[PDB]
C-alpha cells in the first residue's frame, strides 16, 4: 500500500519531468521532421 503510493508519487514526478523538459525537445524534432517532409 505505502510502497504503491510512494512509487506513484515518484512516477508523477517522472512524468512531470519528461513532459516539461524531455517531451518539448523530442516534439520539436518530430515537428521539424514533419515540416521538412511536407516541404518536399
Amino acid at each position: 500500500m505505502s510502497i504503491f503510493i510512494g512509487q506513484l508519487i515518484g512516477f508523477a514526478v517522472i512524468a512531470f519531468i519528461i513532459v516539461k523538459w524531455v517531451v518539448p525537445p523530442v516534439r520539436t524534432l518530430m515537428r521539424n521532421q514533419q515540416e521538412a517532409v511536407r516541404a518536399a
Partner: protein, 234 residues
C-alpha cells in the same frame, strides 16, 4: 532484498519456465507488434509521416548508417532488421519498467519486471546474436575458413586471446545488458524499503535516469551487434 524468485514459474516439456519473465517478454512483443502494425497501416511515402513512422524511420536510418559505415548494406541486408528489432525490443522492455507496476506484499512485488533483469532473456538475445553473426561469417568465408579467421583474428600469434575475445562477445553482450537492468530491479526494491513520504524522491530520480540508461543500453546492444557482424563477415 529477495533477489530472484521469479513468479508464475511453471514446468513444461520437462523443463522449468519463469512465467513472469515470459509475460514481460510477451508484453514487450505485443507493444512492438502494435507499433509495427500501426506503422504498416499508416505508412505513407507521399503523405506526412505519423509519429510511429518517424520513430521507425529514425531507428532504421541510424542502423542502416551504422551498417553502411561498418559493413556494406549489400553484404549485410539481413542485419538491419536484426538491429532494429533488437533495439526496439530492449528499449520497450526497459521503458515498460518505468510504469508504476509495483506494490507491497510485506516485501515489494512488481507486476512488470523488466525481462532483461532475468538471465534467460539477455542470454537468449546474446546467444541468438552470437549464432547469427557466426553463421554469417561461415556463409561469407566458409565452414572451415571462418573458424580459421576467427582464431587468427587480425594478429595470428594472439590466437588464444582471440578465442577468448570471441567467447567474450556473447557473455559480455549478455551480462552487460543483464547487470544494468538486473541492478535496477534491486534499486527499485531497495528504494521500496523507504517510507512512502521519502520513497518517491530516490525512486523518481533513479527511474528518470533509468529511462536514458535503458535507451543507451538498447543502443549499445544493437550497435555492438552490428559491429560484431561487420567483424565476423570481413
Amino acid at each position: 532484498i529477495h533477489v530472484g524468485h521469479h513468479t508464475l514459474v511453471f514446468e513444461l516439456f520437462g523443463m522449468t519456465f519463469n512465467g513472469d519473465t515470459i509475460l514481460a517478454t510477451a508484453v514487450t512483443a505485443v507493444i512492438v507488434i502494435a507499433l509495427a502494425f500501426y506503422l504498416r497501416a499508416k505508412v505513407t511515402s507521399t503523405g506526412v509521416p505519423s509519429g510511429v513512422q518517424l520513430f521507425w524511420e529514425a531507428l532504421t536510418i541510424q542502423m542502416r548508417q551504422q551498417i553502411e559505415g561498418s559493413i556494406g548494406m549489400k553484404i549485410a541486408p539481413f542485419v538491419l532488421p536484426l538491429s532494429v528489432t533488437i533495439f526496439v525490443f530492449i528499449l520497450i522492455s526497459n521503458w515498460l519498467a518505468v510504469l508504476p507496476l509495483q506494490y507491497g506484499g510485506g516485501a515489494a512485488a512488481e507486476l512488470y519486471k523488466a525481462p532483461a533483469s532475468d538471465i534467460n532473456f539477455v542470454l537468449a538475445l546474446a546467444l541468438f546474436v552470437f549464432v547469427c553473426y557466426h553463421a554469417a561469417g561461415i556463409w561469407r568465408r566458409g565452414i572451415v575458413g571462418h573458424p580459421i579467421k576467427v582464431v587468427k583474428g587480425h594478429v595470428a600469434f594472439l590466437a588464444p586471446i582471440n578465442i577468448v575475445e570471441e567467447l567474450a562477445k556473447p557473455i559480455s553482450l549478455a551480462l552487460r545488458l543483464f547487470g544494468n537492468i538486473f541492478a535496477g530491479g534491486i534499486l527499485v526494491a531497495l528504494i521500496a524499503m523507504f517510507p512512502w513520504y521519502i520513497q518517491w524522491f530516490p525512486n523518481a530520480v533513479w527511474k528518470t535516469f533509468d529511462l536514458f540508461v535503458g535507451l543507451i543500453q538498447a543502443f549499445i546492444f544493437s550497435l555492438l551487434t552490428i559491429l560484431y557482424f561487420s567483424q565476423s563477415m570481413e
